[PDB]
Amino acid sequence: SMAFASVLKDAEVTAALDGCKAAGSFDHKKFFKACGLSGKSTDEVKKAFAIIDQDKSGFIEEEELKLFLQNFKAGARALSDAETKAFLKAGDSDGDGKIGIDEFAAMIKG
Ligand SMILES: [Ca+2]
Ligand SMILES: [Ca+2]
């Protein structure tokens, strides 16, 4: 659902949601950089990591990664098998199958 709408501008993330609408065209970097998440404070990020976390499993398993579009909405599709892979290695620096916060704030911090 529109959670980030609180943190960021629902209208802002919107364009960030339509920017990925394109299959195999999802550019997380562009996304975070769009809403501004990229460069933001590592504090808020942790708060942005919840928006996504729908099961508060503590982490964002590879299965949750593809659910990086269900954070800004409760319906948005899920990154492809590759898209999720890119967004994985793009963040996960250990390639274990999950992306923690320290890692989630990394893909954005860098
Ligand atoms: Ca989670
Ligand atoms: Ca990890």
PDB file of C-alpha atoms and ligand atoms in Angstrom:
ATOM      1  CA  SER A   1       0.000   0.000   0.000  1.00  0.00           C
ATOM      2  CA  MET A   2       0.935   3.660  -0.226  1.00  0.00           C
ATOM      3  CA  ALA A   3       3.180   3.614   2.821  1.00  0.00           C
ATOM      4  CA  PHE A   4       6.158   5.574   1.553  1.00  0.00           C
ATOM      5  CA  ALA A   5       3.551   8.166   0.657  1.00  0.00           C
ATOM      6  CA  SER A   6       4.225   9.319   4.199  1.00  0.00           C
ATOM      7  CA  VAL A   7       8.008   9.340   4.060  1.00  0.00           C
ATOM      8  CA  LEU A   8       8.315  10.561   0.491  1.00  0.00           C
ATOM      9  CA  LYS A   9       5.838  12.109  -1.916  1.00  0.00           C
ATOM     10  CA  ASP A  10       3.346   9.561  -3.190  1.00  0.00           C
ATOM     11  CA  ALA A  11       3.503  11.537  -6.414  1.00  0.00           C
ATOM     12  CA  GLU A  12       7.274  11.212  -6.376  1.00  0.00           C
ATOM     13  CA  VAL A  13       7.494   7.477  -5.807  1.00  0.00           C
ATOM     14  CA  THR A  14       4.680   7.227  -8.328  1.00  0.00           C
ATOM     15  CA  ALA A  15       6.977   8.198 -11.176  1.00  0.00           C
ATOM     16  CA  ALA A  16       9.426   5.792  -9.584  1.00  0.00           C
ATOM     17  CA  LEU A  17       6.798   3.077  -9.810  1.00  0.00           C
ATOM     18  CA  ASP A  18       5.987   3.845 -13.427  1.00  0.00           C
ATOM     19  CA  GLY A  19       9.691   3.908 -14.198  1.00  0.00           C
ATOM     20  CA  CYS A  20       9.850   0.213 -13.394  1.00  0.00           C
ATOM     21  CA  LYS A  21       6.446  -0.583 -14.846  1.00  0.00           C
ATOM     22  CA  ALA A  22       8.550  -1.483 -17.862  1.00  0.00           C
ATOM     23  CA  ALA A  23       9.385  -5.168 -17.642  1.00  0.00           C
ATOM     24  CA  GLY A  24      13.075  -5.921 -17.261  1.00  0.00           C
ATOM     25  CA  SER A  25      13.355  -2.148 -17.162  1.00  0.00           C
ATOM     26  CA  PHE A  26      13.317  -1.748 -13.399  1.00  0.00           C
ATOM     27  CA  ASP A  27      16.186   0.435 -12.245  1.00  0.00           C
ATOM     28  CA  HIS A  28      16.260   0.347  -8.461  1.00  0.00           C
ATOM     29  CA  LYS A  29      19.103   2.845  -8.501  1.00  0.00           C
ATOM     30  CA  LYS A  30      16.882   5.131 -10.541  1.00  0.00           C
ATOM     31  CA  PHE A  31      14.038   4.327  -8.176  1.00  0.00           C
ATOM     32  CA  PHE A  32      15.808   5.221  -4.951  1.00  0.00           C
ATOM     33  CA  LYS A  33      17.450   8.110  -6.764  1.00  0.00           C
ATOM     34  CA  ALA A  34      14.022   9.102  -8.023  1.00  0.00           C
ATOM     35  CA  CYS A  35      12.223   9.247  -4.696  1.00  0.00           C
ATOM     36  CA  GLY A  36      15.543  10.557  -3.436  1.00  0.00           C
ATOM     37  CA  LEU A  37      16.029   7.550  -1.189  1.00  0.00           C
ATOM     38  CA  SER A  38      19.491   7.499  -2.720  1.00  0.00           C
ATOM     39  CA  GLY A  39      21.721   9.804  -0.711  1.00  0.00           C
ATOM     40  CA  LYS A  40      19.099  10.224   1.988  1.00  0.00           C
ATOM     41  CA  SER A  41      19.887   9.466   5.612  1.00  0.00           C
ATOM     42  CA  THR A  42      20.817   5.920   6.551  1.00  0.00           C
ATOM     43  CA  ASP A  43      18.334   6.395   9.369  1.00  0.00           C
ATOM     44  CA  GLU A  44      15.233   6.905   7.258  1.00  0.00           C
ATOM     45  CA  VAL A  45      16.365   4.085   5.002  1.00  0.00           C
ATOM     46  CA  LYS A  46      15.894   1.701   7.904  1.00  0.00           C
ATOM     47  CA  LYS A  47      12.392   3.128   8.085  1.00  0.00           C
ATOM     48  CA  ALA A  48      12.038   2.673   4.344  1.00  0.00           C
ATOM     49  CA  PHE A  49      13.074  -0.949   4.707  1.00  0.00           C
ATOM     50  CA  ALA A  50       9.915  -1.559   6.703  1.00  0.00           C
ATOM     51  CA  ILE A  51       7.610  -0.182   4.036  1.00  0.00           C
ATOM     52  CA  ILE A  52       8.652  -3.156   1.938  1.00  0.00           C
ATOM     53  CA  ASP A  53       8.933  -5.702   4.724  1.00  0.00           C
ATOM     54  CA  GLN A  54       5.394  -7.040   4.627  1.00  0.00           C
ATOM     55  CA  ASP A  55       6.107  -9.999   6.903  1.00  0.00           C
ATOM     56  CA  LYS A  56       8.775  -8.267   9.002  1.00  0.00           C
ATOM     57  CA  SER A  57      10.833 -11.410   8.540  1.00  0.00           C
ATOM     58  CA  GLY A  58      13.773  -9.286   9.623  1.00  0.00           C
ATOM     59  CA  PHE A  59      15.329  -9.522   6.181  1.00  0.00           C
ATOM     60  CA  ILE A  60      14.452  -9.273   2.508  1.00  0.00           C
ATOM     61  CA  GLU A  61      14.956 -12.766   1.141  1.00  0.00           C
ATOM     62  CA  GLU A  62      15.531 -13.162  -2.580  1.00  0.00           C
ATOM     63  CA  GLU A  63      11.807 -13.825  -2.717  1.00  0.00           C
ATOM     64  CA  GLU A  64      11.111 -10.512  -1.022  1.00  0.00           C
ATOM     65  CA  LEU A  65      13.503  -8.650  -3.290  1.00  0.00           C
ATOM     66  CA  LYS A  66      11.141  -9.113  -6.211  1.00  0.00           C
ATOM     67  CA  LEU A  67       8.607  -7.659  -3.804  1.00  0.00           C
ATOM     68  CA  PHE A  68      10.444  -4.355  -3.991  1.00  0.00           C
ATOM     69  CA  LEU A  69       7.418  -2.978  -5.801  1.00  0.00           C
ATOM     70  CA  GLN A  70       4.861  -4.115  -3.252  1.00  0.00           C
ATOM     71  CA  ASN A  71       6.241  -1.607  -0.776  1.00  0.00           C
ATOM     72  CA  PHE A  72       5.001   1.476  -2.587  1.00  0.00           C
ATOM     73  CA  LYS A  73       1.761  -0.378  -3.213  1.00  0.00           C
ATOM     74  CA  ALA A  74      -0.095  -3.519  -2.210  1.00  0.00           C
ATOM     75  CA  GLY A  75      -0.516  -4.978  -5.677  1.00  0.00           C
ATOM     76  CA  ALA A  76       2.411  -3.832  -7.786  1.00  0.00           C
ATOM     77  CA  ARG A  77       3.946  -6.768  -9.617  1.00  0.00           C
ATOM     78  CA  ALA A  78       7.274  -8.274  -8.626  1.00  0.00           C
ATOM     79  CA  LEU A  79      10.589  -7.738 -10.374  1.00  0.00           C
ATOM     80  CA  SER A  80      11.384 -10.458 -12.882  1.00  0.00           C
ATOM     81  CA  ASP A  81      13.670 -13.368 -12.089  1.00  0.00           C
ATOM     82  CA  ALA A  82      16.560 -11.321 -13.424  1.00  0.00           C
ATOM     83  CA  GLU A  83      15.448  -7.914 -12.203  1.00  0.00           C
ATOM     84  CA  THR A  84      15.415  -9.343  -8.699  1.00  0.00           C
ATOM     85  CA  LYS A  85      18.820 -10.846  -9.385  1.00  0.00           C
ATOM     86  CA  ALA A  86      20.310  -7.520 -10.407  1.00  0.00           C
ATOM     87  CA  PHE A  87      18.677  -5.741  -7.492  1.00  0.00           C
ATOM     88  CA  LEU A  88      20.120  -8.527  -5.374  1.00  0.00           C
ATOM     89  CA  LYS A  89      23.780  -8.459  -6.335  1.00  0.00           C
ATOM     90  CA  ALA A  90      23.294  -4.711  -6.546  1.00  0.00           C
ATOM     91  CA  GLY A  91      22.645  -4.728  -2.817  1.00  0.00           C
ATOM     92  CA  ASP A  92      23.525  -8.049  -1.230  1.00  0.00           C
ATOM     93  CA  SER A  93      27.292  -7.997  -0.874  1.00  0.00           C
ATOM     94  CA  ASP A  94      27.366 -11.584   0.381  1.00  0.00           C
ATOM     95  CA  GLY A  95      24.887 -13.172  -2.038  1.00  0.00           C
ATOM     96  CA  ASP A  96      23.364 -15.351   0.658  1.00  0.00           C
ATOM     97  CA  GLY A  97      19.808 -15.012  -0.595  1.00  0.00           C
ATOM     98  CA  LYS A  98      18.739 -12.169   1.663  1.00  0.00           C
ATOM     99  CA  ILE A  99      19.272  -8.426   1.845  1.00  0.00           C
ATOM    100  CA  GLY A 100      19.533  -6.943   5.318  1.00  0.00           C
ATOM    101  CA  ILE A 101      19.191  -3.284   6.223  1.00  0.00           C
ATOM    102  CA  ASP A 102      22.897  -2.518   6.279  1.00  0.00           C
ATOM    103  CA  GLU A 103      22.807  -3.918   2.763  1.00  0.00           C
ATOM    104  CA  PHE A 104      19.583  -2.190   1.792  1.00  0.00           C
ATOM    105  CA  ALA A 105      21.102   1.134   2.774  1.00  0.00           C
ATOM    106  CA  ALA A 106      24.172   0.158   0.787  1.00  0.00           C
ATOM    107  CA  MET A 107      22.601  -0.213  -2.636  1.00  0.00           C
ATOM    108  CA  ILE A 108      21.394   3.319  -2.003  1.00  0.00           C
ATOM    109  CA  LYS A 109      24.379   4.701  -0.132  1.00  0.00           C
ATOM    110  CA  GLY A 110      26.351   3.577  -3.161  1.00  0.00           C
TER     111      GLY A 110
HETATM  112 CA    CA B   1      10.573  -8.738   5.142  1.00  0.00          CA
HETATM  113 CA    CA B   2      22.542 -10.336   3.583  1.00  0.00          CA
END
